[PDB]
Structure formats: structure tokens, C-alpha cells
Amino acid sequence: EEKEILWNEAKAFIAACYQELGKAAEVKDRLADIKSEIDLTGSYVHTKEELEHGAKMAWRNSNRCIGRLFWNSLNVIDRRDVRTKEEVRDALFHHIETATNNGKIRPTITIFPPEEKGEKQVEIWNHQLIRYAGYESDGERIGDPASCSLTAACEELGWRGERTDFDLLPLIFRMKGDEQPVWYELPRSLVIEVPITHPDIEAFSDLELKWYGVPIISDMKLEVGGIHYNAAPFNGWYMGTEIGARNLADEKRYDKLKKVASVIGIAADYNTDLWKDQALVELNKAVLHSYKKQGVSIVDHHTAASQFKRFEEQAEEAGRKLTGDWTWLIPPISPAATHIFHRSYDNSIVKPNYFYQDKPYE
Amino acid sequence: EEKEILWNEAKAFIAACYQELGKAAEVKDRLADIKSEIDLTGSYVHTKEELEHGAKMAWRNSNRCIGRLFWNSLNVIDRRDVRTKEEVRDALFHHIETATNNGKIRPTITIFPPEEKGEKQVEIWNHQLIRYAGYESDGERIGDPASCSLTAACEELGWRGERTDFDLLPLIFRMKGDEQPVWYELPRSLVIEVPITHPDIEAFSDLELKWYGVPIISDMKLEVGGIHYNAAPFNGWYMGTEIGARNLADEKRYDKLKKVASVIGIAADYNTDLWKDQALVELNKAVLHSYKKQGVSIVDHHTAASQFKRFEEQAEEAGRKLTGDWTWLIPPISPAATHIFHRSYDNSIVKPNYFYQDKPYE
Ligand code: HEM
Ligand code: HEM
Ligand SMILES: N=C(Nc1cccc(OCCOc2cccc(NC(=N)c3cccs3)c2)c1)c1cccs1
Ligand SMILES: N=C(Nc1cccc(OCCOc2cccc(NC(=N)c3cccs3)c2)c1)c1cccs1
Ligand SMILES: C[C@H](O)[C@H](O)[C@H]1CNc2nc(N)[nH]c(=O)c2N1
Ligand SMILES: C[C@H](O)[C@H](O)[C@H]1CNc2nc(N)[nH]c(=O)c2N1
Ligand SMILES: [Cl-]
Ligand SMILES: [Cl-]
């Protein structure tokens, strides 16, 4: 059955991919070649073209992604050649460098060897390649609570964080045949960070907030034509609200709203003062201003929704059904000020696509 | 089949209602009496108790309503006795007076005779009993665009608005046997309105914004035990965001954000300045401050979500499944600052409930 599922997904992917690439006449012989290779080997190897276009299609089919206008410009790095943890490490390092691009962020994915019999060749533990550690001991809370369980697991393995609120987690991943993962400290020269200041309010620097430049999701499975690339880290640039309205704002993350209200000089005592809303706006202004001042790519939620509207029009122009998850597309502040809020979206799953997978710790 | 659907809905409603009222032992004989009356008459009449508890249950089952904590305190006015348009008019007038309660708003529903063979006894045309007219002629836009088609229909019938941006629409409804509806101008002494000022920014009054005190939804069908009360206007009080983030903010409503930005002294030129977000916060602050200064009931979205959280806990305590529509429960500003955003809700339809019905104009 495994092989039948593979074949079915393969024929659907190859016909749609080759059609988009103006390569329709080659489907027949390519599908023949695939059917044999599946027969003979239990799987099949994607060509460079299939692999690149598949990763791009997967982004285009990502229902929760507002940044999909730029799906066709994805920079695909084919690292199916790696066999050593040193090669994996260097690949991850390179991905950080090339994607960061001195602040002018390049949407990028690095693709590692896929699962074989559902057996992972390479298993990445980080949620993002660059993220901050989190600690909770006897009432004492430091850093990013979303990172508490991975942090605890790294420290099991002999890593030790400095216990600032912004400790960079090491890269941590496991190789097929290894019982334990390895970890490598990130070279600080590879990691761009932005201090958060506000354009008008000087006291805002008293918060000593910062965030990293490039979010690189490293724990999702890329699925293309029945082949499961469980290790395939990818990045775009941030939408400001991800940092200003969630990472720094949520009570279960950095929980900064009360401190924000204090430095902007408003009381945080009455719901009817809308001090949370006001702190949200200033914090979010500060984040966009800071990334822009430093020369690090970022987009605001209004601009991003305007791009997504273009993505919708483009899909219609091309004859493709549009899919989307309304609950994730609406931004977490002023959602009704975007067109997204005022329409609905078909949440069907189309492949290729990126999927969640179980975490090896926890 | 109509009668079978009726009977089925009736037995489900009577058992659940009598159970909640500690009246379980009476279900059997009451259901007998109902089965006969359906047999003999084609329908059945609710008791005072059933009618009151049914309307309350319908509110409790309203998935899109964040204000449901207070479902059991609903004030139910039984107007199944009316036969004349003068009685209907006076009922609507009374509902406005008693619900307004000099600003200390009382959640209220007035229930008129139900449909018979799907034949309406009374057909209310207003979307709310109190709403502002809207006009669009040769590029010229006045008032509330959501009201353009009902306004045009009223003016068909010989009503004429003054063409301010805040013309009160007349009550308009039709009686069984009549070909045309009638309209009655609202006595201004019945309608409480609130001028919008801002607690800190004096210029905010230059916008000359106002809104009415009491939103009274007058076009939804109440369904209780298979009986269809198509005319059953109800009200609570406003959540501030309904006015400040939607009615006054949407581009297809009053579209005030650019004017708001100007009076609060910020530029409306750059998406990255988050001027829309900032204008939203100040406009929303102004609305809550204004209702509170006047002594007219209103709730902010944070307080309302905290109440709804209590509603959820109360449902669990009572053993009732909770249903909700996430897309409507999240407020339109700072949704992620409420607990609602961070959980999901079963959007199943449970009856009794309020439903949409086709508009007699358009
Ligand atoms: C170009 C810049 C991009 C922007 C501004 C952007 C924006 C976003 C945002 C704001 C989210 C919601 C994330 C959250 O709430 O945690 C998201 C989700 C997502 N984006 Fe994008 N994105 C971009 C590029 C990409 C790229 C390059 C890919 C893959 C090739 C991608 C795939 C996804 C996926 C799979 C999700 C959903 C993740 C999940 O379910 O947890 N995006 N995007
Ligand atoms: C006590 C004060 C109340 C508050 C603060 C409140 C709050 C709200 C809000 C903010 C909405 C969304 C409306 C929109 O976006 O247009 C809503 C929807 C709703 N509320 Fe309530 N509500 C209250 C009382 C009531 C009452 C008394 C009933 C009926 C007895 C009711 C039934 C509903 C229904 C049916 C909807 C959905 C309407 C639709 O689908 O268009 N609510 N409520
Ligand atoms: N701008 C960005 N933001 C962004 C884009 C995509 C995802 C993202 O983070 C979302 C994290 O979401 C969750 C939520 C719950 C659990 C998890 N973890 C898992 N992978 C799961 C395992 C099992 C169930 S969920 C991830 C942030 C980008 C990063 C990379 C490309 S664009
Ligand atoms: N605070 C309030 N706000 C509130 C509560 C409930 C509804 C509400 O207005 C929602 C209007 O929603 C729509 C949206 C689209 C169409 C319609 N009109 C119709 N009835 C339809 C006919 C056919 C399809 S929809 C109404 C506002 C209250 C008023 C009364 C009690 S609480
Ligand atoms: C398409 C989308 O469901 C629609 O615009 C909804 C979104 N959520 C909403 N939520 C509320 N409370 N009121 C509304 O009018 C809407 N509009
Ligand atoms: C329960 C709810 O679906 C959940 O909290 C979602 C809501 N929408 C979201 N939207 C985005 N972009 N990111 C998120 O993490 C979430 N969380
Ligand atoms: Cl993030
Ligand atoms: Cl309204």
C-alpha cells in the first residue's frame, strides 16, 4: 500500500508540475521511468527541476501563509548529497548566511535527503534554526517559554545557556544510526539581531528588547510527489506582527505589554483605557521602525495583505483554485482593516505542501 | 412532513426545557397535549414559561455571540397578542423605551405572533429598530452605506430623509394581508444618541461623530421547538469595537480612519507607521469614554472576553456542550490579546436559536 500511495502521489505531482513547466509531452516517459524505479527500488529520485518546482508549489499551497505572492522566487538549495553531521552543520550555517544576505533577506529552503521507509536520514530538533532559549525554575522565568522543553533537552546533552532572556539555542539534530543528536553553538557573526527602539519615544530602549533577523522554520516536513522531506528548513522575512503582537506580546511568550505601557507613559489599570491595544500599536511601530533602520527586511501587516490580495488575483488569472486558512491569514492586530477579514477561504489541503511532524523531544 | 418536523423539534425542546426548569415529570402529559394540538390544529402554542426559557436558550446557543454570559437575565416581552399595526408600532416603541432604560440598558426581546403555514403574521423590514439611513447618488455618499437599499425602499413609500449622515430610519414593517409595509417616524425622545469625544484630544469633537445607544436586531428569526418567530426583535448593549472598529471604521461603512488620524495629529501616508492601527485605538477609546461619560451601557472587548470565559466555565460546570464561531467571537482589534483567539470552538448549530432570513426588499 505504501508503494501504491507513492505511485499515486507521484503521477499527480509529475503531471501538474510538468504542465506548469510547459513540459507536458515528457510526463509519459518520465512516469514510466518512475514506475520502474519504484518497482525496482521502493522509491524514486526527483530531478533538480522537480525538486525546485515542488518546494515552490508547496509554499504556494500553504493555506496559513499570507506571504505567498512571492512563491515563485523561492531560492531552493539541493543538499540531498549530505551524509555527515559536519556537512549538515555547514549546510545549516550556509543557509543562515545566504538567506540573511546582509539584511536583504532571500526566501530560501535547504533540502536534505528524504525519509526512505519512513526512516529519517537527518532529524532536525530546532523549531527555528535561530531561536532563543527559555528557562523556568522555582517561580523564576527567563527567556522564551515556547523554548523551555527544547532548551531542557539541549542542557541534557551538555549545552549550557548563559540565562539571559535572549540566549541563542545551539543547532541540534540527529543522524540516522545515531542514538543521540549533536549540538553546535551558532557563530554570532552569522546571526543578525535588531535592538527594538521607537521612532518618537526615547525611553523605549529602556526595555532592552531585541529580536533576530531571520525566522527559519526547521521542523516541518516538505512533501512533494509522495516523497517525504522531513528535513527541509525554509525562511522568508518576518511580518512585523509576528514579533510585536505575538512573540513579545503573548502572556505565554515574552509578555511585554505592561512594561510597554509604562515606558510610553500610560496607565495599565483599566480595560476601558485600551492600554493593551495602545501598547500593541506602539510596540508594533517600534519593531517595524527598528528593522527598517537597521536595513533588515520586514513587512507590515497592511502591505502584506495587499500582496496577498495580489496573490489571490494572480491565482484566478492562472486558473488555479485558491486555498487558505482564514484563522491564520488574518493578522493579530487590526484584522478588519485588511480585506482578508471580509472574505472567506477554502481550507482544503493541496499537495505539495509543508506539514507538521512529531517533536523528537517532549 | 412539515408536521413531523414540528413534532420532532417540539419533543426535543420540551424535554430539554422542562429538564432545565426542574419540570421533568410534566414532559409526558405536556407532550401528549402538544401531539393532539398539532394533530387538531397544525401547530401548537407555547406556554409563557416555554416561551421565555426558549428565547433565553436561543441566546445561549448563539455561536457568534460573545455576550452570552448573561443569557439567563434576558427580559422577554410576550406580544403574541397583537393583531394591528398600531399595536405592533406601540410594541416596538415600548421595546425601545424599556430596553434603553434611561441608559442602563436591559437586554430585551419582544416576541410577536409566529408564522403559521410559514405565513408571517408580522414582517419587520428594519435590520435594527434604530439605524441610520444611507444614500448614494452621482458620486455623492451620505450616511450609512449598509442602509442604502432599505433607505431607498422607505423613500419609495413616501418617507423622506433629511440627508444628514445620521438620519434615523422610520420603523417599517408589513402585516399579513397587506401588500405594502407601513412606516412610522421614531419619536426622537425615545432614541438615545451619544456624541463621540475623546478623553484627551479636544479636536476629536471636530469629527462630529455620534452613534445611537441601543442596537436592536429586528430581522432575525427566533426558532423554539419547531415554532418560527420571524418577528422577535432583541437587544443587548454594544461592545465598543462594533462601533469604533467596524461601523465607523470600515471603508464600506462610515470610513473615518483617515479623518481620525488627522485630528489626532498623525500622518496617514505610510503603512509602516501603523496609522490605521493607531487611529483604531484612539477611535475605540473615544467611543468607550463617550458612552461611559453619558451613562449609557457599553462593554470593552477585553472585559467582554473575560465574561465569555466565564460563560465557557459555566457551561462546563452545568454539563452543557459549548458551541461558538471563532471567526465572530474574536474581536476586530487586538484579538490575540483575548483568550478566545488561542482556543477553538465547535461551530455546531443547536436549537433554540436565532437565524437569518431573506430580506423583503432587495
Ligand atoms: C517571504 C516572506 C514571508 C512572509 C512575510 C510570510 C508570512 C507568514 C506568516 C505571518 C505566517 C504565520 C506564522 C505564525 O503565525 O506563526 C506564515 C505561515 C507560514 N508560512 Fe509564510 N511567509 C513568508 C515566506 C514563506 C516561505 C518562504 C515559506 C516556505 C517556503 C512559507 C510557508 C509558510 C508556512 C508553511 C506557514 C504555516 C506554518 C504553520 O502551520 O505553523 N512562508 N507565513
Ligand atoms: C448583553 C449584551 C450583548 C453583547 C455585548 C453582545 C455582543 C455581541 C457581538 C459583539 C456580536 C457580533 C455582532 C456583529 O459583529 O455584528 C454579537 C452577535 C450576536 N449576538 Fe450578542 N451581545 C449581547 C446580547 C445579545 C442578546 C440579548 C441576544 C439575543 C437574545 C444576542 C444574540 C446575538 C446573535 C444572534 C448574534 C449573531 C448575529 C449574526 O449572526 O449576525 N446577543 N453579540
Ligand atoms: N515569517 C515567518 N513566520 C513563520 C512562518 C511559518 C511558521 C512560523 O511559525 C509557526 C509555528 O507554528 C506552530 C504551532 C504549534 C506547534 C508547532 N510545532 C509543530 N511543528 C507541531 C508538531 C505537531 C503539531 S504542531 C508549530 C512562523 C517565516 C518563517 C519561515 C518562512 S516565513
Ligand atoms: N451588541 C449587539 N450587536 C449585534 C448583535 C447581533 C447582530 C449584530 O449585527 C449583525 C448583522 O449581521 C448581518 C450580516 C450580514 C447580513 C445580515 N442580514 C441578514 N439578516 C441576512 C439575510 C440573509 C443572509 S444574512 C446581518 C450586532 C447587539 C444587538 C442586539 C443584541 S446584542
Ligand atoms: C468572511 C468573514 O467570516 C466575515 O467578514 C466576518 C468575520 N468575522 C466577523 N466577526 C464579527 N463579530 N462580525 C462580523 O461582521 C464579521 N465578519
Ligand atoms: C485556536 C486558534 O486557531 C489559534 O490560536 C491560532 C489562531 N490564528 C493564528 N494565526 C497565526 N498567524 N498564528 C497563530 O499562531 C494562530 N493561532
Ligand atoms: Cl517567530
Ligand atoms: Cl451595529
Side-chain angles (χ1 to χ4, degrees):
Chain A
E1 169 67 358
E2 66 306 302
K3 166 188 166 160
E4 172 181 338
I5 283 162
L6 180 53
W7 171 241
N8 288 336
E9 295 289 345
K11 71 168 82 173
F13 165 72
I14 296 289
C17 177
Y18 279 45
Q19 186 60 232
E20 294 178 18
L21 295 176
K23 296 206 160 188
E26 318 185 26
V27 175
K28 176 169 179 47
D29 299 317
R30 175 52 173 161
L31 281 188
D33 289 337
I34 294 190
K35 195 175 169 289
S36 293
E37 184 176 355
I38 288 179
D39 284 345
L40 296 161
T41 78
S43 182
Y44 77 101
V45 177
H46 280 131
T47 70
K48 166 262 163 60
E49 236 193 347
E50 289 162 359
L51 181 59
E52 176 173 356
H53 202 69
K56 291 174 174 188
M57 289 172 84
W59 182 8
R60 188 181 77 206
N61 285 331
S62 293
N63 291 2
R64 297 172 162 186
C65 181
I66 192 175
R68 291 181 278 164
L69 177 60
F70 308 113
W71 66 272
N72 194 38
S73 76
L74 183 69
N75 166 42
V76 182
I77 309 177
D78 173 11
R79 285 325 295 284
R80 288 176 294 167
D81 54 326
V82 315
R83 300 294 184 262
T84 81
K85 36 180 81 64
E86 295 83 18
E87 292 170 319
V88 173
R89 176 197 57 201
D90 288 347
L92 302 171
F93 282 175
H94 178 258
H95 184 130
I96 292 158
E97 180 166 40
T98 188
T100 295
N101 192 30
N102 290 308
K104 200 165 160 299
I105 294 173
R106 274 184 291 215
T108 305
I109 179 169
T110 299
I111 303 184
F112 290 106
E115 299 172 356
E116 301 208 352
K117 45 179 74 172
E119 190 184 13
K120 313 194 191 314
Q121 298 315 280
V122 172
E123 167 191 282
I124 300 175
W125 290 28
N126 308 83
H127 166 65
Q128 291 173 36
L129 297 190
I130 299 160
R131 230 193 183 189
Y132 299 128
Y135 315 78
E136 159 108 65
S137 46
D138 315 352
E140 172 179 39
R141 310 170 81 262
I142 297 164
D144 190 341
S147 293
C148 279
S149 57
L150 178 61
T151 298
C154 288
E155 295 198 314
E156 281 303 299
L157 289 157
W159 179 80
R160 174 70 177 198
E162 280 161 71
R163 285 167 168 69
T164 82
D165 280 343
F166 304 106
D167 291 355
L168 296 177
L169 283 168
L171 294 179
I172 171 172
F173 58 88
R174 184 187 61 78
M175 306 296 301
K176 177 185 74 180
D178 283 352
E179 193 152 306
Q180 296 296 357
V182 288
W183 57 266
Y184 306 98
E185 194 70 44
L186 291 165
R188 301 279 308 195
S189 74
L190 279 195
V191 177
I192 286 216
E193 283 183 302
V194 180
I196 308 297
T197 53
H198 184 284
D200 304 308
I201 300 171
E202 269 300 304
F204 207 95
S205 47
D206 301 335
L207 297 186
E208 294 165 54
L209 298 183
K210 67 179 186 192
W211 207 254
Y212 47 90
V214 193
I216 315 172
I217 296 296
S218 52
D219 66 355
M220 290 182 83
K221 168 173 299 147
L222 166 63
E223 194 180 329
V224 169
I227 302 311
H228 289 54
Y229 302 97
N230 64 277
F234 60 82
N235 71 285
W237 50 79
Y238 266 112
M239 189 162 70
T241 55
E242 298 179 73
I243 300 161
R246 298 305 309 285
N247 298 348
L248 293 178
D250 291 356
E251 282 173 23
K252 289 166 151 43
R253 302 295 301 285
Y254 282 75
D255 194 18
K256 292 303 177 154
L257 293 189
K258 292 161 117 183
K259 283 174 165 173
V260 169
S262 183
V263 295
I264 73 180
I266 67 181
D269 294 330
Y270 301 92
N271 287 346
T272 58
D273 292 337
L274 305 186
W275 69 261
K276 286 190 179 171
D277 305 77
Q278 194 170 337
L280 277 163
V281 168
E282 301 302 340
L283 179 51
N284 278 275
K285 280 162 66 181
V287 159
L288 293 165
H289 164 73
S290 303
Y291 275 64
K292 292 167 84 60
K293 175 193 264 162
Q294 192 156 315
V296 178
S297 302
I298 193 160
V299 68
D300 63 272
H301 50 293
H302 303 288
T303 305
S306 299
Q307 285 160 347
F308 188 65
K309 173 74 170 89
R310 287 186 52 205
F311 175 73
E312 309 180 12
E313 293 153 352
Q314 163 184 115
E316 193 43 54
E317 280 167 12
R320 297 186 298 260
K321 276 163 213 313
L322 171 66
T323 54
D325 185 339
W326 190 94
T327 69
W328 275 59
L329 293 158
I330 58 161
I333 48 163
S334 314
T338 71
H339 77 283
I340 298 179
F341 184 90
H342 304 272
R343 59 158 295 178
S344 58
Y345 297 88
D346 172 7
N347 198 20
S348 307
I349 315 293
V350 184
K351 296 175 180 187
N353 212 334
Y354 301 100
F355 296 91
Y356 289 150
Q357 37 188 356
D358 292 348
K359 299 215 136 273
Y361 54 101
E362 274 160 352
Chain B
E1 169 67 358
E2 66 306 302
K3 166 188 166 160
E4 172 181 338
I5 283 162
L6 180 53
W7 171 241
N8 288 336
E9 295 289 345
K11 71 168 82 173
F13 165 72
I14 296 289
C17 177
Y18 279 45
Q19 186 60 232
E20 294 178 18
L21 295 176
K23 296 206 160 188
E26 318 185 26
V27 175
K28 176 169 179 47
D29 299 317
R30 175 52 173 161
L31 281 188
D33 289 337
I34 294 190
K35 195 175 169 289
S36 293
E37 184 176 355
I38 288 179
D39 284 345
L40 296 161
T41 78
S43 182
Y44 77 101
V45 177
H46 280 131
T47 70
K48 166 262 163 60
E49 236 193 347
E50 289 162 359
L51 181 59
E52 176 173 356
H53 202 69
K56 291 174 174 188
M57 289 172 84
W59 182 8
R60 188 181 77 206
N61 285 331
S62 293
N63 291 2
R64 297 172 162 186
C65 181
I66 192 175
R68 291 181 278 164
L69 177 60
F70 308 113
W71 66 272
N72 194 38
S73 76
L74 183 69
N75 166 42
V76 182
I77 309 177
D78 173 11
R79 285 325 295 284
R80 288 176 294 167
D81 54 326
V82 315
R83 300 294 184 262
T84 81
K85 36 180 81 64
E86 295 83 18
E87 292 170 319
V88 173
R89 176 197 57 201
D90 288 347
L92 302 171
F93 282 175
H94 178 258
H95 184 130
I96 292 158
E97 180 166 40
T98 188
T100 295
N101 192 30
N102 290 308
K104 200 165 160 299
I105 294 173
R106 274 184 291 215
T108 305
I109 179 169
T110 299
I111 303 184
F112 290 106
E115 299 172 356
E116 301 208 352
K117 45 179 74 172
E119 190 184 13
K120 313 194 191 314
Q121 298 315 280
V122 172
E123 167 191 282
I124 300 175
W125 290 28
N126 308 83
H127 166 65
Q128 291 173 36
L129 297 190
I130 299 160
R131 230 193 183 189
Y132 299 128
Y135 315 78
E136 159 108 65
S137 46
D138 315 352
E140 172 179 39
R141 310 170 81 262
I142 297 164
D144 190 341
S147 293
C148 279
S149 57
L150 178 61
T151 298
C154 288
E155 295 198 314
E156 281 303 299
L157 289 157
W159 179 80
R160 174 70 177 198
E162 280 161 71
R163 285 167 168 69
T164 82
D165 280 343
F166 304 106
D167 291 355
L168 296 177
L169 283 168
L171 294 179
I172 171 172
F173 58 88
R174 184 187 61 78
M175 306 296 301
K176 177 185 74 180
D178 283 352
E179 193 152 306
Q180 296 296 357
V182 288
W183 57 266
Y184 306 98
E185 194 70 44
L186 291 165
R188 301 279 308 195
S189 74
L190 279 195
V191 177
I192 286 216
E193 283 183 302
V194 180
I196 308 297
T197 53
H198 184 284
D200 304 308
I201 300 171
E202 269 300 304
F204 207 95
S205 47
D206 301 335
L207 297 186
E208 294 165 54
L209 298 183
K210 67 179 186 192
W211 207 254
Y212 47 90
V214 193
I216 315 172
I217 296 296
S218 52
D219 66 355
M220 290 182 83
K221 168 173 299 147
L222 166 63
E223 194 180 329
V224 169
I227 302 311
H228 289 54
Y229 302 97
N230 64 277
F234 60 82
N235 71 285
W237 50 79
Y238 266 112
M239 189 162 70
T241 55
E242 298 179 73
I243 300 161
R246 298 305 309 285
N247 298 348
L248 293 178
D250 291 356
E251 282 173 23
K252 289 166 151 43
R253 302 295 301 285
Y254 282 75
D255 194 18
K256 292 303 177 154
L257 293 189
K258 292 161 117 183
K259 283 174 165 173
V260 169
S262 183
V263 295
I264 73 180
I266 67 181
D269 294 330
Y270 301 92
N271 287 346
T272 58
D273 292 337
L274 305 186
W275 69 261
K276 286 190 179 171
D277 305 77
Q278 194 170 337
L280 277 163
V281 168
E282 301 302 340
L283 179 51
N284 278 275
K285 280 162 66 181
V287 159
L288 293 165
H289 164 73
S290 303
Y291 275 64
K292 292 167 84 60
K293 175 193 264 162
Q294 192 156 315
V296 178
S297 302
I298 193 160
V299 68
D300 63 272
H301 50 293
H302 303 288
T303 305
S306 299
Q307 285 160 347
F308 188 65
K309 173 74 170 89
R310 287 186 52 205
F311 175 73
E312 309 180 12
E313 293 153 352
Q314 163 184 115
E316 193 43 54
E317 280 167 12
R320 297 186 298 260
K321 276 163 213 313
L322 171 66
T323 54
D325 185 339
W326 190 94
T327 69
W328 275 59
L329 293 158
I330 58 161
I333 48 163
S334 314
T338 71
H339 77 283
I340 298 179
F341 184 90
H342 304 272
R343 59 158 295 178
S344 58
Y345 297 88
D346 172 7
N347 198 20
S348 307
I349 315 293
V350 184
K351 296 175 180 187
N353 212 334
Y354 301 100
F355 296 91
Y356 289 150
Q357 37 188 356
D358 292 348
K359 299 215 136 273
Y361 54 101
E362 274 160 352

